[PDB]
Design a protein around this ligand. Structure first.
Ligand SMILES: O=c1[nH]c(=O)n(COCCO)cc1Sc1ccccc1
Ligand SMILES: O=c1[nH]c(=O)n(COCCO)cc1Sc1ccccc1
Ligand SMILES: O=c1[nH]c(=O)n(COCCO)cc1Sc1ccccc1
Ligand SMILES: O=c1[nH]c(=O)n(COCCO)cc1Sc1ccccc1
Ligand SMILES: O=c1[nH]c(=O)n(COCCO)cc1Sc1ccccc1
Ligand SMILES: O=c1[nH]c(=O)n(COCCO)cc1Sc1ccccc1
Ligand SMILES: [K+]
Ligand SMILES: [K+]
Ligand SMILES: [K+]
Lengths: 250, 251, 250, 250, 253, 251
């Protein structure tokens, strides 16, 4: 291996410069199966890597795991191996009433409610997505047909208190995050997820291209427990968009 | 007489205009308005000068923000009160990347928040991000009229001197916080310095208003050059041509 | 021109060391008319400069505009040309019930609700006025006769949310400034304006003398809209003091 | 499932109140195998859960993945299921010259270089380990025989810049972390890892007991590349200590 | 012949007679009381709020030196004692409990402190834990068991003020700054035991400089029941805590 | 016996006094009180020593704060409870400017807040500013008795050593935040270091209490580290004379 965690060499990549980066290691094969000649490369900890082909060009699919820290490891080590473009496909909870379950969200930039982004750039630096990647994702969503919303995402280091969930062991939220969801809602923030702030900051401050897309499986203004079939169908719709966007970026 | 505190304008003066081109320099307001059909002076109070024009049969407003976030926040808020929902900023800038030349056009996706006014609308963690449709329109407009264009991050500073790490000053010193800051922004791929985008982009993105940012490069901080007057006017006119062309796509 | 913005040479000043710095460019001519032999030097952007004479000594009047950014440009470039003393005359909204419209406020130091001050000194540094300038302003106010209050001013980077105005497009104020006016009120803060924090910090941290005076045209505890007559009379009232204070400091 | 991510019900735990929480999902089976009646329960994303028996009492082993964010999910959901005591066993890079590879480190408290801890308590709150858990770990290390160091740990949201690694794609470290390792070294900080700040903060501020132990596989003052034999032995050595400590806390 | 090796304490290295441990109360009036519990106590110096006594414990010299109230004077005392050769510091203090289950007369051992002070920042950034030394904490817990006391072990909120930082409204202004409004309830929910005024500075400055520090306090008031402490119970609680800190020092010699 | 928690004073003990002189050193209290009429010791508890005296027929309190903001905040609050509305601090200081000599008198207009206690009364953005009347009285008193006086900004630190960038210590290190800080304050025109003014000035200015700050220079950091044990006594006597004369002007 050429890297500390991923278990990959430069040769394993076969000249690939683009990586699709899901959070869930189980999503990796599912994404790679959508493309030509899918091949398993490695699996260590939360990092599962597959190689495939898109229009005759080698492409990488690699899981980040949940959160900025494991994301930062995966992205850094992929960058060492030659990856220059990163496309994140994730799941999300929407916080705006007009966004429905099954909708697709493309992130222009993220609210930095994480710690890892600060290890690459000070807070004043925008967690902004690459313009070409964002364009490709928006065009891909319009290509396959989806209800799409474009805007700001709140990227949190926690699933519970940082997203103002009170259905917890303690049932309390720290002062800093008390009333925070309502504030983000008023500011037009679309949704909550857990990796985009880190990914977008670390790429935008290091000359790497990054894009972010997510499928809405829950809306916080109406529900908390989603359906275990609409979840899989929403994932498949978002996976279709991210692969189509990758086509436009090769 | 007046529906707002500072601009000295009424809702009827706008005639149903929803878009506004917002330059920093008050003398540039006439320059932009003259490029469009039927230019009319509306009001001139303090640093705020407002001209109304017509683009493709649709009314368009041109309003000076003045230098910096504070007066920009006054202008944008009061225009929004009057009915403006789309704001396109055209400015001047100093590039900090060696590959960006004088005369180049820069479209800002998002800004480094080295200002104070943005914090009055959203906490620092909120991205000073431009509207996607506005950014697209500016990029397309730059390609339409033909320009050397760079798209990326801008450092938006509350000062011209210390916040942009200028040492050619009265004191000759820069506060610890900004010492070595230019080199840091350079390494992070930040294209340039200006003084209004962080405030404009934050206050619009956090209030459901669309904002775009474009600037003409009149100086590059890495090369030994003294700003030329003839090139300064040419670059201004070039950037003005793009912001008007982009406004056509957003109405 | 020897400066980037003001459009003045060192010779244009004629050895002037004191400058009266108003916010309104339309107020420069008003202040210059109170002194002997007024001459318009330059008008560029929001910066309008007039050269006048006070007691056989040249005095500069130069507009800063609203807010710290242009104030920082104006003060720095005047310092480059040779100005060592700065006297700000402004308008203000009082937040204490005992301060009336038409009253004159002399600022000892300012609450730093601005960004530009941080570009000269860290937040812990006091936005304090020069003792001689403050003395001169207090003495000048007592000389011409005025209802004067001396104390702390809140200097904000915005007119609306930073001064907790809700009569706005959004009708919302960010969490940080929610309930802030009541807090400043309890702390004995007299008023809101938009330039003093920047001016006082940048002068006190660079060996320049600065003073701050303002006329009350609005009181936030009673009424938001001022008329026409009282507004103009308060401005003329305040201008007289700043010229009289300049006489003591030369 | 009773929880969102772990795929576990309260019944699955059989009355367990203690969990051993490694970062690596592959380590879960290894820890469980040291105890009686080891049984696999679930595996979803980076969360692999096993149940075993210690002195007749049920005990849980559950991987957190790398970093505070996924740790915060695992710890929250385990708490919901009934876990009250959390013992982390991890890997670490030592930054003190006197600490050797193969040594065992017990963390009293952590430097909070993470984001997730802030979602439970403000920065001023100490990321402190539970006294009983720390005692048990120190006693367990003394029981099986190990070279043990007790003290402060730097817990970082990144593996690279936050631990001041320059052997990276960019080769740069953000200003905030430039010279940070030398600072921690002078302050007597023993080591770097990636989960303790989150774990210790979230437990100490929610009435949960937490302990932290780690095996040194690298010392940053001498070498960077760990050997894949000492690594396995150090892990085994640390696993035996955490299991013995768990015995003392039942 | 020689008067002082340090700026404030008015002590020479010889005054210490080879002592490496110091008991550091906040109150200069408490110094004699602690010293009197050990063998052959003698007053060494008294300057400002720094009163110093030396005494003998199991044939080994021990220093008792007051810090005064707050981090600033604590930082002076600890630093100058360290210059004089002290390597182990044991703080004995008074405290106001904020948990309902902790009673007046109870003894609290601090594992680590919430840093509501300024002086700790002069030694380490806020992210650094104001954590007590493990051996010192162990010795204090064992000493509390030894002499018999109702003991609670956990986190302490260490404040730069007695009033607003501890959310007291019974004041001249009757107001508390936004930052500390509702702060007590927050600390209570986080399981914080009590308020005092020196531990954050002491623990941070020692833990970041290779010095061993321990923290123990006697509860003279519980904020969820009363505000004014009884004079008699105060003396008994102080005496109870003083006995524990000496017994802990015995285990650390 | 006592109306307050720490000072050991009743309001009756004060005899209607509204002004207090507040030295840091409890042993300086008797020295200040001896300069006025009818000096009597009232209480001595912890670092708080209180004397009462008479100035032009008006009762005045002298009460020590101890070193640092925390004990200062207790003393000031509890004196305010007893009816004190005007506070005058007399202290010792180390000058950091080359032009300020040992024996000079410094009047503080406002303080750099390098303390923690000030934050418990007002957020950092609030200026640690002295009362204008108190500052005036101190400047006039210094000119009255004759002294080399400097007026300006003071750095008020929660530590004597690292916060004032002293390296002559046990560890020999200074935390990153304060590394190079003295040079920064020097460039910013900060006169000196002391340990109570930020707390005192912030807590008074934000609670409607009048506060003044004066200090005698016993060390200049650019020329020495150790004060002279004779010039110290002379300088203290000098400053004490000024604070009593200022107190005369404020009754
Ligand atoms: O509300 C959310 N917040 C969020 O950060 N994500 C992203 O995925 C993080 C790991 O589940 C996904 C959702 S949607 C959801 C709601 C309940 C259970 C699982 C997912
Ligand atoms: O370096 C710059 N920084 C910057 O913030 N701007 C934007 O215009 C602000 C007011 O001139 C423009 C420039 S380019 C320049 C260089 C020298 C003199 C005037 C403009
Ligand atoms: O409330 C105020 N806040 C404030 O920052 N200022 C200073 O002048 C800013 C430009 O009008 C002046 C006032 S008074 C006022 C009230 C309504 C309209 C214009 C001024
Ligand atoms: O230096 C370190 N920093 C650190 O945070 N850890 C903890 O485990 C993080 C995931 O590998 C482990 C180590 S030791 C090391 C050194 C080289 C490659 C892999 C681990
Ligand atoms: O609530 C407290 N807060 C606190 O910081 N301490 C510690 O000693 C500080 C100086 O008395 C002690 C107490 S208990 C108390 C209550 C009322 C009057 C005196 C002490
Ligand atoms: O440099 C100083 N910094 C400072 O904060 N003070 C104020 O008095 C604090 C307790 O001595 C006094 C001085 S002068 C000095 C220098 C060496 C030993 C004692 C006093
Ligand atoms: K302006
Ligand atoms: K993870
Ligand atoms: K003290």
């Amino acid at each position: 291996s050429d890297v500390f965690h991923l278990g990959l060499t430069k040769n394993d990549l076969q000249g690939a410069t683009l990586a699709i980066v899901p959070g869930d290691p189980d999503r990796v094969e599912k994404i790679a199966a959508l493309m030509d000649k899918p091949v398993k490369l490695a699996s260590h900890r939360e990092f599962t890597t597959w190689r495939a082909e898109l229009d005759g060009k080698p492409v990488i699919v690699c899981s980040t795991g949940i959160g900025g820290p494991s994301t930062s490891i995966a992205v850094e080590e992929l960058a060492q191996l030659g990856i220059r473009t990163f496309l994140r496909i994730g799941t999300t909870g929407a916080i705006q009433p007009h966004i429905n379950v099954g909708d697709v969200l493309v992130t222009t930039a993220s609210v930095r409610l994480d710690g890892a982004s600060l290890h690459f750039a000070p807070l004043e630096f925008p967690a902004v997505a690459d313009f070409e990647c964002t364009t490709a994702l928006v065009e891909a969503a319009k290509s396959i047909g989806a209800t799409t919303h474009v805007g700001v995402t709140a990227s949190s280091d926690t699933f519970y208190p940082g997203q103002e969930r009170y259905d917890t062991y303690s049932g309390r939220v720290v002062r800093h995050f008390k009333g925070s969801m309502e504030e983000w809602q008023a500011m037009g923030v679309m949704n909550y997820e857990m990796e985009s702030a880190t990914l977008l900051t670390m790429c935008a401050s290091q000359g790497l291209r990054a894009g972010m897309v997510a499928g809405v499986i829950v809306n916080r203004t109406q529900q908390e427990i989603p359906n275990a079939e609409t979840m899989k169908q929403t994932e498949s719709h978002a996976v279709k968009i991210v692969v189509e966007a990758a086509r436009r970026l090769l």
